[PDB]
Amino acid sequence: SVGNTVLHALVEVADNTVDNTKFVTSMYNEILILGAKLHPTLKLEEITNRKGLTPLALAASSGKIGVLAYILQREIHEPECRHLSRKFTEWAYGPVHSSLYDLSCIDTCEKNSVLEVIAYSSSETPNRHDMLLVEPLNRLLQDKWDRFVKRIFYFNFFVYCLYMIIFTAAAYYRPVEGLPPYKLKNTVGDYFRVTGEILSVSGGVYFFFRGIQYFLQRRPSLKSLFVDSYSEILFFVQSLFMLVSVVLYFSQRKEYVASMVFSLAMGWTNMLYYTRGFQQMGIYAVMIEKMILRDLCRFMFVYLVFLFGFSTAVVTLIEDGSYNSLYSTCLELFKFTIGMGDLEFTENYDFKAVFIILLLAYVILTYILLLNMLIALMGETVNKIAQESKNIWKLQRAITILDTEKSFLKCMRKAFRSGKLDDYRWCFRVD
Amino acid sequence: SVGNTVLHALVEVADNTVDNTKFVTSMYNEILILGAKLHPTLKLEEITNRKGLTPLALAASSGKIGVLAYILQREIHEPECRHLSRKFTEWAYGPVHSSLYDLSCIDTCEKNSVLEVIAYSSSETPNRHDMLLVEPLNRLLQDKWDRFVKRIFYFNFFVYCLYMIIFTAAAYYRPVEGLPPYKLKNTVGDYFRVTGEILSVSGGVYFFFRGIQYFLQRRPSLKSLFVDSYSEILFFVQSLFMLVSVVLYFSQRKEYVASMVFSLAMGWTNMLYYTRGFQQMGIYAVMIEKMILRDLCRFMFVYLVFLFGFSTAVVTLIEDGSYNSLYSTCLELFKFTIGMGDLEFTENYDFKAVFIILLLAYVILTYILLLNMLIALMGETVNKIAQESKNIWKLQRAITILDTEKSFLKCMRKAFRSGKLDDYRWCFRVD
Amino acid sequence: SVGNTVLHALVEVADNTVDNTKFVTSMYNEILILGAKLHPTLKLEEITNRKGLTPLALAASSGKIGVLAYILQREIHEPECRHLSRKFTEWAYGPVHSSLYDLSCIDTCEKNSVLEVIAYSSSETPNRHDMLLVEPLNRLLQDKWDRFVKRIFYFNFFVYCLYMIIFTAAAYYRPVEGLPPYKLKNTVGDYFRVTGEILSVSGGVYFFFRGIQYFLQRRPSLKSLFVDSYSEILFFVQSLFMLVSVVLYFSQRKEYVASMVFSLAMGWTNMLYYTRGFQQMGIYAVMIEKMILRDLCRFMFVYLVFLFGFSTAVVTLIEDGSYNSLYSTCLELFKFTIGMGDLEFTENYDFKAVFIILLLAYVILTYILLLNMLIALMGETVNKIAQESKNIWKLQRAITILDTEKSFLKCMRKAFRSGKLDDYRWCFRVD
Amino acid sequence: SVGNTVLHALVEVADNTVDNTKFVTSMYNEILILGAKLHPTLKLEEITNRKGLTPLALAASSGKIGVLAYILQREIHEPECRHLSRKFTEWAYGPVHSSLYDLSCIDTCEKNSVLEVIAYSSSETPNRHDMLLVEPLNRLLQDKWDRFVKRIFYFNFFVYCLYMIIFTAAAYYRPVEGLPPYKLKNTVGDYFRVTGEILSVSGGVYFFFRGIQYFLQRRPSLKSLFVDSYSEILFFVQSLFMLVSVVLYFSQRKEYVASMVFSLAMGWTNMLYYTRGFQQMGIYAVMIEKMILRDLCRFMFVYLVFLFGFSTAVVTLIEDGSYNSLYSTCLELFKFTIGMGDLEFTENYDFKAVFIILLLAYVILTYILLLNMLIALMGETVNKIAQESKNIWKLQRAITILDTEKSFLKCMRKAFRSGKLDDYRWCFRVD
Ligand SMILES: C=C(C)[C@]12C[C@@H](C)[C@@]34O[C@](Cc5ccccc5)(O[C@@H]1[C@@H]3C=C(COC(=O)Cc1ccc(O)c(OC)c1)C[C@]1(O)C(=O)C(C)=C[C@@H]41)O2
Ligand SMILES: C=C(C)[C@]12C[C@@H](C)[C@@]34O[C@](Cc5ccccc5)(O[C@@H]1[C@@H]3C=C(COC(=O)Cc1ccc(O)c(OC)c1)C[C@]1(O)C(=O)C(C)=C[C@@H]41)O2
Ligand SMILES: C=C(C)[C@]12C[C@@H](C)[C@@]34O[C@](Cc5ccccc5)(O[C@@H]1[C@@H]3C=C(COC(=O)Cc1ccc(O)c(OC)c1)C[C@]1(O)C(=O)C(C)=C[C@@H]41)O2
Ligand SMILES: C=C(C)[C@]12C[C@@H](C)[C@@]34O[C@](Cc5ccccc5)(O[C@@H]1[C@@H]3C=C(COC(=O)Cc1ccc(O)c(OC)c1)C[C@]1(O)C(=O)C(C)=C[C@@H]41)O2
Ligand code: NA
Ligand code: NA
Ligand code: NA
Numbered sequence A, B, C, D: 001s002v003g004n005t006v007l008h009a010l011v012e013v014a015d016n017t018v019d020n021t022k023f024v025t026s027m028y029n030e031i032l033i034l035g036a037k038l039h040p041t042l043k044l045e046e047i048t049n050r051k052g053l054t055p056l057a058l059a060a061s062s063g064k065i066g067v068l069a070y071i072l073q074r075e076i077h078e079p080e081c082r083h084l085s086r087k088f089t090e091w092a093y094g095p096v097h098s099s100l101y102d103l104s105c106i107d108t109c110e111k112n113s114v115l116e117v118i119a120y121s122s123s124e125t126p127n128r129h130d131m132l133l134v135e136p137l138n139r140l141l142q143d144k145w146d147r148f149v150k151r152i153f154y155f156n157f158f159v160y161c162l163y164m165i166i167f168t169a170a171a172y173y174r175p176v177e178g179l180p181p182y183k184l185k186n187t188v189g190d191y192f193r194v195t196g197e198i199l200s201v202s203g204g205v206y207f208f209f210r211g212i213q214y215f216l217q218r219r220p221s222l223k224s225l226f227v228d229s230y231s232e233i234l235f236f237v238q239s240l241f242m243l244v245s246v247v248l249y250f251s252q253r254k255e256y257v258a259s260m261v262f263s264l265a266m267g268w269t270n271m272l273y274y275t276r277g278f279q280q281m282g283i284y285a286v287m288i289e290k291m292i293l294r295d296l297c298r299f300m301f302v303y304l305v306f307l308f309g310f311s312t313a314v315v316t317l318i319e320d321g322s323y324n325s326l327y328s329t330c331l332e333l334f335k336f337t338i339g340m341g342d343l344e345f346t347e348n349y350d351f352k353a354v355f356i357i358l359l360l361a362y363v364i365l366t367y368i369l370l371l372n373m374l375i376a377l378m379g380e381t382v383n384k385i386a387q388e389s390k391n392i393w394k395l396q397r398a399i400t401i402l403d404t405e406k407s408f409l410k411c412m413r414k415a416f417r418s419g420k421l422d423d424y425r426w427c428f429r430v431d
Helices: A007-013 A018-038 A055-062 A063-073 A114-119 A129-135 A135-172 A188-218 A230-250 A255-271 A282-317 A326-337 A354-379 A384-407 B006-011 B018-040 B057-060 B065-072 B114-121 B133-171 B190-219 B230-250 B256-269 B271-277 B282-317 B324-335 B350-379 B386-408 C006-013 C017-037 C055-061 C064-073 C114-119 C134-174 C190-218 C230-251 C256-269 C269-277 C282-317 C326-337 C350-378 C386-407 D006-013 D020-036 D054-062 D063-072 D114-120 D130-135 D135-172 D188-218 D232-251 D256-269 D273-274 D282-317 D328-337 D354-377 D385-407
Strands: A087-091 A098-102 A426-430 B088-092 B099-104 B427-429 C088-092 C098-102 C427-430 D088-092 D097-101 D427-430
Touching: A007 A018, A007 A055, A007 C088, A018 A063, A018 C114, A055 A114, A063 A129, A063 A135, A087 C114, A098 A135, A114 A129, A114 A135, A114 A384, A129 A135, A129 A384, A135 A188, A135 A255, A135 A384, A135 D282, A188 A230, A230 A255, A230 A282, A255 C427, A255 D354, A282 A326, A282 A354, A282 A384, A282 B133, A282 B256, A282 B271, A282 B282, A282 D282, A282 D354, A326 A354, A326 D354, A354 B256, A354 B282, A354 B350, A354 D354, A384 D354, B006 B018, B006 B057, B006 C230, B018 B065, B018 C350, B057 B065, B057 B114, B065 B133, B065 D020, B099 C006, B133 B190, B133 B256, B133 B271, B133 B386, B133 B427, B133 C055, B190 B230, B190 D135, B230 B256, B230 B271, B230 B282, B230 C256, B256 B271, B271 B282, B282 B324, B282 B350, B282 C134, B282 C256, B282 C269, B282 C282, B324 B350, B324 C282, B350 C256, B350 C282, B350 C326, B350 C350, B350 C386, B427 D063, C006 C017, C006 C055, C006 C269, C017 C064, C055 C064, C055 C114, C064 C134, C098 C134, C098 D282, C114 C386, C134 C190, C134 C256, C134 C269, C134 C386, C134 C427, C190 C282, C230 C256, C230 C269, C230 C282, C256 C269, C269 C282, C282 C350, C282 C386, C282 D256, C282 D273, C282 D282, C350 D256, C350 D282, C350 D328, C350 D354, D006 D020, D006 D054, D020 D063, D054 D063, D054 D114, D063 D130, D063 D135, D097 D135, D114 D135, D114 D385, D130 D135, D130 D385, D135 D188, D135 D256, D135 D273, D188 D232, D232 D273, D232 D282, D256 D273, D273 D282, D282 D328, D282 D354, D328 D354
Parallel strands: none
Antiparallel strands: A087 A098, A098 A426, B088 B099, B099 B427, C088 C098, C098 C427, D088 D097, D097 D427
16 A cells, blocks of 8 residues: 555564564565565565565664564575575674675665664654664764864864864954944954954855755654754854854844854863763763753743742832832742852842742752752652763764765765675675 | 442452453453342442442542443343443444443543543552543543543643743833832833732632642542642642742832742643643653652751751861851862762862862762662653553543543533433543 | 670671571571570570670670561560560450560660660661661650650750850950959959850860760770761860960960861750751751762862862962962962862963963863762662661660760659569550 | 793682682692602792792782782691691780791792782782782781881871972062073071972982882883872873973073973872771772772763853854854863853854754763763762772882882981891791
8 A cells, every 4th residue: 555565564564572573573584585586687675665674674774673673683594595695604603703794775775774764763652772782883074074074073073173263263352443344454363363364254155055954854843853853954044154253244233243143152062962872971962962952841830930920029028218119020940950049139028038938949949949850850860861861972973974975075975894705795804 | 338339249249350350340340230120220330338339430539440441331131120230332344343331420420430430549549540441431531632622621721821921021021129018100011010900819719719729629539639630739829829929029129039030830730730641751750750759858868967967067177267157068069969069169168078078078979879869760661650650641631521521610510421321321422 | 715605696696687697587586495495594695795785785786687676676476485485465456456574684784785786886887877767765765855855955055055155155255454463453344255255164164074074985906986976075175275375375375266266166066966866957967967968079189189289380370570389379269169279260361262271271170170079969869878877866866865864963863654563674655 | 831830830820719719729839748749959939930929929920819828828737747838836825826837938029029019919810919918918018107107107198298288389489580590599598498309300300210110110011001100100190291391490591480380280199199008098099990990981082072062052153243163162172171161152053943952962961971871870889999009009108118128318227127036037027
């Protein structure tokens, strides 16, 4: 009905349990063998459904770990069936076994490769996180990293550091005259300043168009828009602030500074994107992302409810006879959170006992709030957050490898390890 | 002796263990079959005890989850006994099993339904918390939520937000002249102000009478008054502050403001009641409630003992030669807890070493106390607090559904799924 | 060699493991039966060693919980041996079994009873903590609590509250003239003041002599002096401060205030002693004690090493050209711990970069210290600290019951449950 | 190929698992027996590879705890093979077994002893950490500690305390005249000052040469430089600061103070080195070392990225119309971390909303950072950090014993327990 065959149904049946995995594996193997015996001329696994996914691509995209692990490491040691295998063993010693894997459909299917569907999954799949631990995929990604992607990624991080340093210098040394745009001066420092500004705007345009390219190629669902693509959204919003700053700058508004500094701040925090992909340092940025997306909404809602309620109570209580505004009272109550609450910031009230009782209740409740946030987050420290962060680190490495391979910047796409070692299957030697 | 029958004794025997659950289940099944064979004209499970509870209602109210799960999903596949079943399976596929459950006695018994006794239990029962996860009850509550209760609850939350915004505006813009009540002025701003005040008092009266209705219909035991009914108590106390404010306002006392701001503060914090029912955000309000009721007493007693002891020591030590009162010293020592302790807030003493030693001991002991509070709370985070909070979220969802169904605001009570599909058992189709 | 018999050796063999406990139980039963058959006229278990301990008292004092549990609940249902049993079951129903336990040697041996050795042991024994959960002992202690000790303990806590309130009032309203003792005034307030002072000194003398009595009766080893007897030490030191205050007061030194306030502070914190014995509120009172005795020494040593090192570095760096003392610099660096560190508290230096680097290093290191303290304490929260706190709560209840029974304040010692129900064995009915 | 024999390769087989440990045990026993039967005159285990390691030294250095445990406790009870054993039982009681272990190759091999290779390994080995718990090694190290090393270590700690007190006094009382060196005055205070300075520089020279000696003896790889030899690196850097201070002092620079205070601060914090060796107190210093080396880098990178980004945004936003420098803004934003952030530290801007939004975002993000650091560190508290800290404590105790034995300060190296009890195997009695 959906253009698929029995193998896609087999992929759908599996639920990453031992018995169902073995059942699906047995059916998959027997069906492949019988299909080869019935139709030796047909490629059984190359039929794509209406979504353009092969059974291997469907297993990769659907989060079916057992099926993917079986298929990628499938090996056959009987006549009339060796042509259906993907793994081939070259040497068999005690501790080490050297074997050739098939890179076909893993690096490219011309629509949807295995690494692409794994990396660019919706993140709502059951356990895609561990799919990169499968031997051929793990070693392929590590080889791609150590070969050429590592240097390219470090170069991109260095270039981003230069871009941010130039942006910081250009923004720091912005002229303080009124009503932009500003006329240049013959002093060399001003030529360096405008060169830095031009480079900053160029980088902003680059990130803007890269963000548009990402959103058009990925087409986020608008429900998982922030769950995935978080770093891309932050880079795009930083570029949006940069371009709004350019518009305000040429529109003769000093409010361009209001945009620019936000972009500047975002730009520096966007260096955490490059931190992700490091085994030790990337975990921290991953945890920041997950806390902001997942655990910050409820805390900020409850905290702002308490802050607004008690600030409205306090500002109602105080009357002039300084701080008479709701904003000032909100700031004074927020100061308690940062350990700078005066607790006698005004005397412009009647019923001092009421004012002090309100502030003490706010303090006690706010510390209860912070304590409950801590407790709620520490309830998830039993192997959950650590495993999730290591998994996201692996996924970021995979995504970086895929993006760098997509760019290649050399008009040359060849990045295979062993080559076509007839069975031209793009072998991959693993020792 | 208490008007009950053997089935209620069977309910009492069970203790939510596998062996006793199976034993009680076997006895219940055999008793029902034999009773139907002996008295085919009698409804065996409809006999109520002195408390008006059927054996199903007793199992639900008593926290006997195994017996409840057996009864609600009871199915019979033999002649002469099909009329004793509640579950009826109509289709049996691999992944799909479509069945009709019996809603009789779950939505209403005319005195005590299953959902009512589960939701309004004393909370001291063994395992009521997971009773809402039993398939017919979970599906029924989710159906009621998604059907009509979700919109009504969101509307009530929106109306409460409007009420609180109006109250905040009316209280913020209160006149600052002396000796209320204040004469209405012809300016439109004062017409809006008095309209907002009238609406605020109307909402206060509404919450006051709803609190009275809740306490009269529930009749809390005065020992679990705060363990359950916490949100209702907070709403009622907020309304009490509002009405005391009205009395003081018309009694020509400025002290009405002292009441009003507390109500205002409480009103905003009472928005957390609407937060409960959200799977992610409601856990925070649940944790706040549990910490205030359970853990705050211990910490507040120990902290106040240390604060009062050291403040009495300090105020005794200092002598005039500002802060000479016990209240001022208590505030100055409290300031250490919020990171604003001066540690040299006065020089009006002899024995500077004694004063500084007292303050340092207070600081060290207070941080020891806060550390031990953290430790004691973190000792309870091993899958306990999180599970309790998820359970309370489910219970609040059920309570919201029951209250909304009780109101109905349409002079129409019927909210059944499948209707009378002869055996008119108010079927509920689950797929 | 040590005056003991076979039963004491059997007690020593046990190590609170299932197999060794069963072995010791079998040997104890068989040797008791054989001894009764060989010497029917002798009481086998009444022989005491050189320490005055019976085998039951040795098992209780040595922390051999399995042997104690077997002996206290020993029951015999065969002829020629019933006289060797302690438990006597009178009724055996399904949910309830009504039995008589032997209180002989549990309430008194005239030297060392079971409850006395359990409560007043060094606390270094293996599992004295769970010995109070043994059915006869748990029910006996709960019965003693609910019968008469509960009211006496609450009365003592109330009297201590009155004593501390009187002390706080007398010390707060101390005269501010120089050179005590102070001549009285005919105003009634001064008569109340001197009456309060006399009552405060009387309470101090009472606690002084009670502390002496405790230390003479227990004779602490001076190595477990603080691990046990912590509350008694705090009460004794509070009384010592009171008596030193009396001496300084009559010695014409204002330094009596230096003593008095410490006593006052200690007195208020000593209310936590009465908090212990409550299942919930007592936990903090337990945990604080442990943190002071166990976890505070190492943290304070490391923290003071860092504080003193960086304070010496800073005070060396700064030079006059206010804070030039080591004490002032130590206070200014301590202020960082309480969130009140200025970070520019002086400009009296050369090399501002060095000063700021030192302060930033101190801040980062101190927050690492606090973080590592938290981490180390949280590493022991996996059922260890909480269980110890519950156990110490039970032990404090037992100690309170024993002390109250020792006092009795009625010239009447009998507090047995069932009496001499021939075999007059001071029965205790458990249902 | 590497100068080894079969025993070394067999030792390399083990991976500290039960099955491979048993396999290696059986093969090692059979190889030794057959070699003795084939070559009775040869010492089978004395053959060293190109690294100078015996199979025992290889098992110890390679972190093969099971093989080491078997070899060190090897015992033989058959003829023609007793000469191959190391453990010899002298008495066999029920709870006590008194046996003689062979100290040969444990105290010295003349190149690489067992204790030396265990203590001075790279720390990257699988399970060297628990090798010190092997009965002969644990008892030997405890015997060396209690015999003579405990007093020597406490003497060294006392001498270091005197050195640091003298250094603190000499640096505190440094003259405040310009342009060192300072001329000695005839007043006795300056004689004490110059004596203290000479002693401080002498201690610095001592630690400098001891650091060089250590680095020459170990030759760290420069990649594991800080993970092991952290304490020696800190002592060496303290001495480097001392000697740079000496050079600047005689170079007529006041900047010597800039060096001296660092060597003062480090010196006091280097007392934590002596804290290691206490069971309870040393864990804190171990945790500080691990926190600094492992976790501080990533947290400080992310924190400094946020601080620098928002400081650049804020300093760009503010314009003169005080704090106009990036350094001042960085300090003002750092103040939020220590609870002293003003949140209105300047008004020299336009767009107050932008400034306040930036500061609030920085505050919220920084507290998210601290919360995530806490969470990440608490995720590793499930028996991981505590066990590693206890292990490193045991390692430091062993290192202290080895260094003290290396010094001996008595021109006498003999420290064996039982001596040559014929078979002169340097027996060690364990009971
Ligand atoms: C798009 C979103 C969701 C976002 C954009 C801005 C407004 C952001 O605040 C938030 C909301 C916020 C505001 C204030 C405090 C905390 C969170 O979170 C990010 C967003 C969140 C941060 C903090 O997190 C990071 O950017 C670090 C980071 C971690 C992992 C990544 O993969 C990453 O990719 C670039 C970046 C930085 C800001 O962009 C920033 O510099 C300022 C001034 C505000 C931060 O909104
Ligand atoms: C009736 C009780 C028990 C209660 C009423 C008042 C006085 C309360 O303080 C307490 C005690 C207290 C006082 C100061 C600090 C902490 C706790 O807790 C609640 C009560 C507790 C809070 C904080 O908790 C909440 O109301 C949020 C909430 C969570 C879950 C809910 O189901 C809920 O239902 C409305 C509300 C808000 C206050 O009502 C408030 O706004 C002020 C000024 C004080 C709080 O007393
Ligand atoms: C005898 C000891 C060991 C002790 C006596 C004094 C000096 C003490 O500080 C300590 C050390 C100290 C000093 C400063 C901060 C923390 C700890 O701990 C107790 C001692 C510890 C405390 C804090 O702990 C408690 O007394 C609460 C408590 C808990 C459990 C109990 O069984 C108990 O019995 C009375 C008391 C209170 C003080 O006595 C006090 O009021 C002042 C001014 C200092 C405290 O020394
Ligand atoms: C060589 C390193 C790695 C080191 C040397 C200096 C600069 C150090 O800061 C660090 C980095 C640093 C800076 C500021 C805050 C935290 C960490 O960590 C240590 C180093 C770390 C510390 C804190 O840790 C300790 O020395 C305690 C300690 C624990 C365990 C040990 O075995 C130990 O051996 C001596 C010392 C103290 C300093 O030496 C010090 O006194 C000052 C002023 C800075 C600390 O650099
Ligand atoms: Na904290
Ligand atoms: Na924790
Ligand atoms: Na603070």
